[PDB]
Structures are given as structure tokens and as C-alpha cells.
Design a protein that fits this description.
homotetramer; alpha+beta; Helix Hairpins; Immunoglobulin-like; 2 domains; six-stranded mixed sheet; four-stranded mixed sheet; 5 helices; 14 strands; membrane protein
Chain lengths: ~325, ~325, ~325, ~325
């Protein structure tokens, strides 16, 4: 079995999801604003046309055929409003047509047409911006419901599982992780919240990922990491939050998708280990998503990372 | 009290209106209004031209002669026909007849040109509000930056946040120092730029704007402030330029906002006041005290002198 | 001869101007056609049709509120829509109104408030459909990172000797010269490893240094370039040997991101290597042939033929022998 | 003095309009000529099929007979069909020629015409956006120094070259990287004729993100990691190397990014030279002399390369 060879790697769903999202969103937000923005200007132009009719007073000569009204077949407010909505939207049925005997009518038609073009351009731009975004969120790219600190290669390591559900919509990505918690400092300069970056491979470029399967991304706990002074017993009391952002993720189509999750002090487990999601066999591999979040307890020292390093130094010396 | 969601954090019409206002009517709207009007006027002129050439004007009320365009016997009539055809309304009171090939080709040209103009309209509306570098987007910076003691080391910190809602949480922050440096070789560079690290080595530049932070840069041996003292600062003429870029949660567009600090705006021995106050299950922000700063007790010696004193005390 | 690139142009003979009108039209046609063929058009057709059909059904229904088919013959009664009798009439009116045509043979009459609101909804829904449609067509073009078939990788990565160190190198190039430049490369290796604690990782990813520390991963690519990675302590290949290589069954992926000088867009290329495609103790054959005043590139023969002798043993053992002989 | 104190950002509308008009004066003929033919082809094809549907319907037998309802009212064979096609496709619909309900296939034909016209309008907008909103541009306002020099700076051998813009307000932030291209022969018998080696102009510390408010002298140090470590003054002419410099930045006026490129040869690198100061500060204001952007003046620097300089420094220290 080979990953791939000189290739990318080895569509009704997307359209259906987009249609469902649009249908869900259109009930409350879209139907109100997008309709009212046209309705207000159409009503405004209706009042303007009615005011011009009143100035010309063609209702008095509505039955009179000798008079030439500004707009043919104008009888009342509803007639003017209907003429306005006809003209502005570029329909022009013809039962009512502007005559050639009033320059004010020509000026109004020009203004209405250009303003309607502007409104349509605004409509298209707003629809494009709202529906299409350079970095849209993705329902895939689920994170592990737990982050586990475990024992790896002589050093403690915090890891969380991240992967893609569709097995093809994510190949390349990047990951960043920030711990937010409050300090006190030696000078008493209390800070209600502090952000510190936990290294996940920024120096070595390991932060970039080729996601072909679920990956257990492991942070390394060293003398330059926030968790360097925490232990098993001290973890529950201290309240800290971890925010993990995965970005720069193409979908083998071209756009960029983003995802974000977090972990709380009650959501971090000590001394556990992720259950492997992939099992190999002669000629084949099998991955079962049912064990994506499954974790099993393993033996590990309960001392702090600094305490573990001190114990190792004492034993070596 | 949590600052997360499983897929998000813990309106758009206003942003669109602000973008339209920034684009402004004078820059774009008036120009395209004029181009539309001149287009319609020119095509009305050519409609009069073809009507005169054919002679349709002479036989205004001749049933035998079928005109090129029905009921077109005046300049205002020709202008109405032009504006109706170009904008694709087609009332029908004025209709073309088949027996005029010149009218046919003119209609073809006018339709093509009108579609082109509409495409130009939309493309212009797909440029002024589609650039990937927006305005400041109300991402204010602290009017002052302070230098003081933290973690036992002298550091320079300035407050960064957004007075609007927490609708944007992503930022890369860079800070340059502009100063005139006299080289030991005698060369004088009047505008010298030196980058001060804010976490570039550790990747700490990519910060989370969940709340107004106090961005702090350590004053180490590499830092340009390695020789700046309390009395040295007033007589210097340095400058700091801070540029922060970030993408909003609404759309992938990125806004870039930057500010500057002159030597007057930098204070020695002060500290920012806290802006977040917590309570039993609820947190609050006093955005009034965003720029507030209170004096603290810090040594007046330079960072080099602090290091020398620490070395002497250790020795 | 040097690449003065004073106007961002490599000093190389170019024939891109010849048949440029044919070539650009052909590629913009093919790229647009390949995605849709009959996949976009069908969806467009069904959504427009079902919208129009829906409008027609509701127009027929509102006509079935005594507005017509009761006094159609009688001229005194004024229907909601002039000349609207059957379902076909309703469909033909909905298609005219929604498409912003409005011939006027069938036109709504002002004396029906229920029709004005219906037209109000129909016109705005049609405009929304059109705007969404233009956006859906547009998003195909706006996507960056378009696939590039012009970038090629060497079919055989090779480990060899370089300046006293073991180095793993492979050639990367562009099909035509002066098309892609300032490309960025990144190489990872996928391998199953077992920790000392008994933990098993069926798929472990490790980035191999190709210049990320020094920013050397951004290569100009004027000629087929032999991208090389030096084996050090941090290099995962530091433990493997000549005999271990056929038995490792490790895998390597390489990703290259560049910008096309013609349009300024972004392009991506991706390649893989297996333990069978990594030959030990070989070396690439040069593709450039310099001469007085001119260089010759035999790109038609990539010279993926290799030949070498001397390298053996491993990386760790070689270094150990090095400092043992040194001291 | 008081540089960028304001937080507003401290080329007119007429200039932008003139530039747009100049671009249009060349582009509009190209676009019209290349697209009108296929527009006419589409309309003529649809007019032909609108004629054929009537012909197979055979309504010409009752052209003068109003008793029999035709597919479309008041239609002639060769010309009027094309008129109806153009009146319908582009959403005009005068109404003098209107479809009738008596023919079923006319509805299908109209549906096809409308959907295809929508596709063509989408093509209009796509082509217009591609033509007017190209994502990359080659700005000519950024000029590199015609000469790069090597001199002394704080006891270190440093290679500098001058960069900057022309209108002083187009490019304000830009990243810079430089690669040396040289043929190298290894001790193992390898001969790579085109060896690329990046020279750090501040990539380690992020110093490459220049804030361009004035012509700036970019300086690259010489150390163990610098390829110029062994390059002596006498050795420099014989090296026949080459340097390529790339500078990408973001346009202040429009969020679109711009890129510039330049190169230097062994004959364009001078020993012991300094850029003359382009910008001089006076009382109350500064003055920038763009005429001295490329001007350089000789200065006294040691002729030995960096290695002998380091050896001499070590010997003096010892």
C-alpha cells in the first residue's frame, strides 16, 4: 500500500449543504433586509411619481383624452407604485408608459434607473461578500473532545487528536495553540488574562501538517513551556484555557478553510493516552471514527515536568 | 466564564455601509452617473441621425411609410427610446420595425455596449469593496506606551485592543523603531529602521484578541533600548511604528491598522491599569480606562545598568 | 549570459508571444469548461426552472380566487392579470415577469392588491437568485492555489555525499522556462514509529529540514534545481543505514507552492517517494551545459539517469568514525 | 521630523481617472472585437432556431389569416426571428412580437434562451472582473539601486544596496529577500552550475519587513553563514557571481500587492563605497534629493576579506 504516486493523493453534498444553510438563514435575516431595502426605495419612487402627477394634475384629466398625462394610465397611489416597481426592476409591461411631453418625467426616469443600477450592484456585492468569503469556516476538522498529557520518550507531552471527517477535504494545514491564564508577576502587576504560545513545531516547521488521517498533535513540555511548572495534583486547582486554531487548509479545490476549538482544565486528562484510530493488516488499513475520542489510562509519573527533570538529574548524578 | 465555543467565539450591513461611505460618491458614483448620461445622450443623437437619414421625420403621420421605430418623431422621443433600450426596459410604445437593417445593427451595438457597461459597474463594485487590506477598522492602540518592571526585567508595553465588539480575533503585530544612528565608521544614516521583537522567534506574534491585551517587548541585550536610561529618553528623538493586521470573523478580508509613538508618548516607570474586572460568574470591561496609566516604582537606571547591578549583586 | 531580470524578465529566449491569442483563449476555455461540462448547467437549469414553475403554480392559485376563469368571456370583469386563463398562461406570465422581460400581452391590473405583493416577492426573489448565481459562477475563478501541471519533480530521490556530509537531494523543475519563479518547497516524511513506552503510532509525520531555518526553502527556479537536505542530528534519516533503507518502508511527500509570473496567481505541486524510489549512493546528472556566451538546456532528457560510487555505511556511523579518526 | 505622528497614514482623482481612461482606450477595442462576434453568433443561432420552429409549425400558411394563432405574433422568416431573439435574450421584450400559449415548444425555447442569457451575463461579469481586477501587478514606482556596494559598518564587513519608491506614498511596507546564484564545485566531485544560496537580510529576526517611508539602505552582514565570507577585493572581479533581489509589498492606495525584481553582477558590486545620503534633515523640515538615489562615493575600507579581518581581530584581542 502506497500513499500516492505523483498525484493529489488516494459533488451533490456540497451543493445540498449550501442550499440547506441558505434556506435556514433566509427565514429570519435575509427575507427581512433584502426585501425591505427594495421595498423602501420602490415606495419612495412611487411617492415621487405621484407627486409629479399631482403637480401636473392629470387625475383631473384622467378621463379626458385630449390631455396628455406624464405617465399613461395613472389613476392613483397603487398605479404609481406599480409603475415605479415596473420601471425600477427593468420590466416595463407597457400598459403604463411614460410619454414624451414632460422633461421632469425624463429626469425622474434617469434618476430611478441609475439608482436602481446602484442598488442592484450593492445587492450583488453584499450577496457575494456574505455567501462567499476568502476564509470560510468548515464543519469538518473536528478536534478531540479531550486533550491528554502522557509519557513519551522520557519527557511529558500534551497531545490532542485532530483530523478530517471526509478523508479528502483536508490535506495540508497549519496549527497554532495559545494558552490563556492569569499571572501575578514578581512586581504585583496582576493581569486578568495572559496569552502565551505553546510550541507545536513553529521553529522546525512541524506546525504545518499533511493531514491524510487523524493525527495526535503533541506539544512538548520543556523549560520554555507554560506547563513546565504544573503537576498532576496542581492541575485541577489552576484554571486555564487553551485555544487551538487550525488554518491554511485547502480542500483540494483552492479556497482556505479555518477551524477553532478549546480545552478547559476539566477537559484535560492526566496520565491517559489516545486510542489509535488506524489498524494495519497485510495489504490493507482500517480506520474507525468510533474510536476517535476514545482514551485509555496508562501508567505515568505524577510529578511535575520540572520535578521529573530534577529526579532524572539526581538519578543520573 | 468561558472565552470559547466549540466552533466559534464566546452588523454586516453596517460594515457594507461603512465601506460604501469610504468609497464615497464623488470618487465613483458621480463619474459613472456622468458616463451613463453621456452614453444615453450619444445614442439618442445617433438615433436622431438615423431617423434623419432615413427621412422618418418628414413622414411623421404617413400610414404607408412604416417608420424605423414606431412613434419616434422628436429628440425627447429618441432619448426615451435610447434609455429604454439601453437599460432593457422596452415599454413597447416605441418599437422597431424589421425593415431597417441599420436599426438592427444599432440595436445590437447598443445592447452589447449596455451589457459591457453593466459589467463595468459590477466589476467596479467588485474592486472598491474587495481589496484584502481594509481601513483601521476601529482597532485602536494605546495613546501611550510605558516601560517598567515585569518578571524582574525591564520591558516596554503598550495596550492593544478594539473598542468595538469582539468580532475579530486574529492578529500579527510588528513593531519598527525609527532612529538616526551614527556609525562608528563615520557614516550617518538619518532614517534607520530596527525591528524590535514581540515574539517573532517563538511565534508569539500571532495573538488572540479576545480582550484588550498589553503587548510587551522585553528589553534585552539585543533590544535597541539596551542603552536607554531614565534621563536618556527625554533628549532622544526616536520613534516607534506599530502595525497590526488581522482577519475578521465575518469575512476572510484582512484589516491592517497602525499607529506611532513619539518620545513624548513613552513614559518611564508607569504601568497600564487593568481593564477587565471579574466577579462571581461575570466579567466586565471598563473601556473608559483603556488609555489610563498609573505611576509605579521602578529603578531609573538603564537596562544595561540593571544587568550590571544584578551581576554585581550575584557576584 | 546572465539573468539581469531588470524588468522582472529572465534573459532567456521566449516564444510566448507567438500564438498568444490562440493559447490564452484555449486555456481559459478549457479551464472553464472542464469544471462545468454538464454539471453546473444542469443545476442552474433545475433551480431556475423549479423557481419559475413554483411562481407559475402560485400565480395559477391566485387566479383561482375568482380573479379569472369565471368571467373571462365577459369584458366587464377586470382580472388580476390581463389575458390569464389557464395554467400555461400562468407559467408564461411567471417566466416573463421573473426574467425581467415583460412583453405586456399579459399584464397585471392595478385593481388587485394581492397581485402587487406577489410581484413584489417575485421580482426580489429573481434578483436574489441572479445575484447568487453570479456569485456561484464567480467563486470558481476566485479560488487561488490552482493545480499546475507544468511543475515536475525528479522520479528518484537520491542520497549521496556532499561537502563531507550525507545529503538527500532530488531535482525539481518547470516544464517551460521563465514561467514559474520564487517557489517555496517543504518536505515531510510519513513513517510508523514505536515509542520506548510501548505507544504505537501507525502514521508519524516529521518535517525534514530543506532550509526552513535559513529561509532557503524559497528557491528562484530559473533552471532545474537539485533541492538538497543535509542529514544532521535532527534529521530523521540520521539513524538509517545502507542496508536498512530497503527494509524501512518509509514514505516521503514534497509540496511546492509557487506564483505564476503570467497572471500572478498561485500554483501547487505535490510528489511522493517510497523506499524503492530512494536509491543509495547515486547522483544526479547535470542538465545545464555552459559554453562561451551561451548555456544549453537539454530539458527533453531530464537526465534522471544516475551513476556514483563510494558512499556507504550510515550517517551516525560515518560521523562516529569521523570523530574517532579525528581524535 | 514628526514622522508618521498622525494615525491616518501620513495619485489624485484626476490622475486615477486619466490612468483608467488611458487603459480603457486600449482595452475596449480588444474586448469588444473579441466578444461581439460570439454574441452575434449566439443571437443568430437562436434566431435561426426561432425561424425553424415556426417553419415546422407552418404558420406562414396563415400569415395573413388571423384565425390561426402563430407561435409568436407578427413574425417574418429571415429577419423578424432574429429580432425576436435579440429582444428576448437580453431581457427587453418590446411586445410587438410576443409568444403565444398555443405552442408548447416555444416555452421550452424561451426557458433555454433565458437560462443561456443568464450564463452569458455571468460570463460578462467574470471576464470584466478578470480584465479589471488582476490580482498582481508589476509596479514601476519601486527602483533598486543600480549599484550594490561593500564597506565597513561597526567593525563588520557589510554589503548594502539601496531600495525605495518614487512617489513616496505608494509602497510603505515590503518584505525583501536576496539569493546569490553561483556555480559551485564540491570537494566530492560534484559540479552544480547554478547554486542558489539565500543571504539573510533580516529573515532570522523578521527585519526584512521594511517600513518604506524613504529610500532605505538594506544591509546584509558577512559571517560564517554568508557566502561572501571568503570573497576578497582582489578575488571579487574573478568570481563572476550573480545576485537577484526580490521585493514584495502592499500598495497603500489599494490592498492589491505589488512585486519588484532586480539583479547585480560582479561588475555591479564595488569595494569601499557608500551611498550618498538621499534624505537630509534641516531646521523645521527634511529634504529628499531623488537625483542622488544611485549616486555613491568612495570611502576607505580594508581590502582584505572577512576571514582575514576576523583573524586580525582575534590576533589583536589575544
Amino acid at each position: 500500500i502506497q500513499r500516492y504516486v505523483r498525484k493529489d493523493g488516494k459533488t451533490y453534498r456540497y451543493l445540498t449543504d449550501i442550499f440547506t444553510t441558505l434556506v435556514d438563514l433566509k427565514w429570519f435575516f435575509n427575507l427581512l433586509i433584502f426585501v425591505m431595502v427594495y421595498t423602501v426605495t420602490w415606495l419612495f419612487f412611487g411617492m415621487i411619481w405621484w407627486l409629479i402627477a399631482y403637480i401636473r394634475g392629470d387625475m383631473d384629466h384622467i378621463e379626458d383624452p385630449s390631455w396628455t398625462p406624464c405617465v399613461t394610465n395613472l389613476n392613483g397611489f397603487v398605479s404609481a407604485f406599480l409603475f415605479s416597481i415596473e420601471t425600477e426592476t427593468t420590466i416595463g409591461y407597457g400598459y403604463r408608459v411614460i410619454t414624451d411631453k414632460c422633461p421632469e418625467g425624463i429626469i425622474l426616469l434617469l434618476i430611478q434607473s441609475v439608482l436602481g443600477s446602484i442598488v442592484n450592484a450593492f445587492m450583488v456585492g453584499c450577496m457575494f461578500v456574505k455567501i462567499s468569503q476568502p476564509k470560510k469556516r468548515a464543519e469538518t476538522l473536528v478536534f478531540s473532545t479531550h486533550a491528554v498529557i502522557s509519557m513519551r520518550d522520557g519527557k511529558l507531552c500534551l497531545m490532542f487528536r485532530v483530523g478530517d471527517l471526509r478523508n479528502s477535504h483536508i490535506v495540508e494545514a497549519s496549527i497554532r495553540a495559545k494558552l490563556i491564564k492569569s499571572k501575578q508577576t514578581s512586581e504585583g502587576e496582576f493581569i486578568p488574562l495572559n496569552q502565551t504560545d505553546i510550541n507545536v513545531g513553529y521553529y522546525t516547521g512541524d506546525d504545518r501538517l499533511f493531514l491524510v488521517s487523524p493525527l495526535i498533535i503533541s506539544h512538548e513540555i520543556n523549560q520554555q513551556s507554560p506547563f513546565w511548572e504544573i503537576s498532576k495534583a496542581q492541575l485541577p486547582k489552576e484554571e486555564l484555557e487553551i485555544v487551538v486554531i487550525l488554518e491554511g487548509m485547502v480542500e483540494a479545490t483552492g479556497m482556505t478553510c479555518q477551524a477553532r476549538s478549546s480545552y478547559i482544565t476539566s477537559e484535560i486528562l492526566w496520565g491517559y493516552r489516545f486510542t489509535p484510530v488506524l489498524t494495519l493488516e497485510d495489504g490493507f488499513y482500517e480506520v474507525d471514527y468510533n474510536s476517535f475520542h476514545e482514551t485509555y489510562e496508562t501508567s505515568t509519573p505524577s510529578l511535575s515536568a520540572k520535578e521529573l527533570a530534577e529526579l532524572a538529574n539526581r538519578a543520573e548524578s
